[PDB]
Design an enzyme around this catalytic site. Structure first.
Site, PDB file in Angstrom:
ATOM      1  N   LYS A  59      48.413  17.242  50.522  1.00 41.98           N
ATOM      2  CA  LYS A  59      49.314  17.448  51.649  1.00 41.98           C
ATOM      3  C   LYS A  59      48.768  18.590  52.493  1.00 41.98           C
ATOM      4  O   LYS A  59      48.590  19.705  51.993  1.00 41.98           O
ATOM      5  CB  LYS A  59      50.734  17.776  51.178  1.00 41.98           C
ATOM      6  N   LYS A  77      56.480  19.551  52.541  1.00 34.05           N
ATOM      7  CA  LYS A  77      56.911  18.164  52.404  1.00 34.05           C
ATOM      8  C   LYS A  77      56.619  17.606  51.021  1.00 34.05           C
ATOM      9  O   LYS A  77      57.312  16.690  50.571  1.00 34.05           O
ATOM     10  CB  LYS A  77      56.277  17.309  53.501  1.00 34.05           C
ATOM     11  N   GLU A 127      61.438  21.654  60.795  1.00 33.22           N
ATOM     12  CA  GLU A 127      60.324  21.350  61.687  1.00 33.22           C
ATOM     13  C   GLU A 127      60.803  21.377  63.135  1.00 33.22           C
ATOM     14  O   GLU A 127      61.911  20.928  63.436  1.00 33.22           O
ATOM     15  CB  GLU A 127      59.759  19.958  61.382  1.00 33.22           C
ATOM     16  N   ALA A 158      49.489  22.844  59.195  1.00 37.41           N
ATOM     17  CA  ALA A 158      48.862  23.707  60.181  1.00 37.41           C
ATOM     18  C   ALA A 158      49.954  24.384  60.990  1.00 37.41           C
ATOM     19  O   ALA A 158      51.056  23.848  61.151  1.00 37.41           O
ATOM     20  CB  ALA A 158      47.918  22.929  61.101  1.00 37.41           C
TER      21      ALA A 158
END
Length: 271
Positions: free
Chosen positions: A210, A49, A142, A213
């Site tokens: 940033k 991101k 995502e 995980a």
């Protein structure tokens, strides 16, 4: 020297936690660096991101997009962990609001909406190539990109490649000065890494970071440290293959922060 001591500390930390750890640190004040596995691939997870926001800002700089553009999206577009975009869905959000949500809060739908303006994962990969990064690749959106399977090239970077991107975006000339400041501000406002690198920093030091995980015990934190009294420090920390809890993984990254801060202090003192 301090670099060798930091590298030994990282090697011991990696072994006692049963992980594969990848770190690049570069202190702009002393111009010194240290690393561990910095040319190996690691899953980016949400650390992508930072690049996505950089690519949007670069488009805004060249008039290819506008931070004030209102983006509409549907309930059907919402993915897991969308604390900002979820409640705002019916009204939409501007590109700048989406950049902030993605970077500061790690909002996953926001990340996907940014990718949609870039030509998807191929657009982010192309952006990285334009920054001189020959390794990083994004392939999925995502939350599919968080699989983090060992050996899988998809959705990976290297610690050194990502540190180079941090340098170009936050400290170099990939962005105009105003956009560089916006990105730094979004990173510095994040809380998602409070128990990761930031937890290892001396009092008065700041990090704009940033986190990410994913599967297979993957937990990452990248960013720029602004010490209390020194020039900025680039840091990229990727951890994978942990069998431990998330809190235990976070504590490993906090220790990376302490190792990095000590090296910076040692270079400063002339130790």
């Amino acid at each position: 020297n301090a670099a060798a001591q930091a590298q030994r500390q990282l090697a011991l930390l990696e072994q006692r936690h049963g992980v594969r750890l990848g770190v690049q640190v570069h202190d702009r004040d002393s111009d010194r660096a240290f690393s561990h596995r910095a040319d190996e691939r690691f899953p980016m997870c949400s650390t992508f991101k930072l690049l996505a926001a950089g690519a949007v800002l670069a488009r805004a700089d060249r008039g290819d997009d506008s931070l004030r553009r209102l983006i509409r999206y549907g309930a059907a577009d919402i993915v897991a962990y969308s604390p900002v975009t979820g409640p705002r869905q019916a009204e939409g959000m501007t590109l700048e609001q989406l950049c902030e949500a993605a970077v500061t809060r790690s909002d996953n739908t926001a990340g996907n909406l940014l990718l949609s303006t870039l030509g998807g994962p191929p657009g982010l990969t192309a952006y990285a190539r334009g920054l001189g990064d020959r390794m990083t690749r994004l392939d999925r959106i995502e939350t599919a990109l968080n699989e983090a399977r060992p050996g899988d090239p998809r959705d990976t970077t290297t610690p050194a490649a990502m540190a180079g991107n941090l340098q170009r975006l936050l400290l170099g000339d990939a962005l105009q000065s105003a956009s560089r400041q916006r990105l730094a501000d979004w990173l510095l406002a994040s809380q998602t890494g409070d128990t990761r690198l930031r937890a290892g920093l001396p009092a008065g030091w700041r990090i704009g970071d940033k986190t990410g995980a994913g599967g297979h015990g993957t937990n990452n934190d990248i960013g720029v440290i602004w010490p209390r009294d020194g020039a900025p420090v680039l840091i990229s920390a990727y951890l994978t293959q942990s069998s431990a809890s998330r809190e235990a993984q976070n504590a490993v990254l906090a220790e990376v922060g302490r190792i990095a801060a000590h090296a910076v202090a040692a270079w400063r003192l002339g130790s």
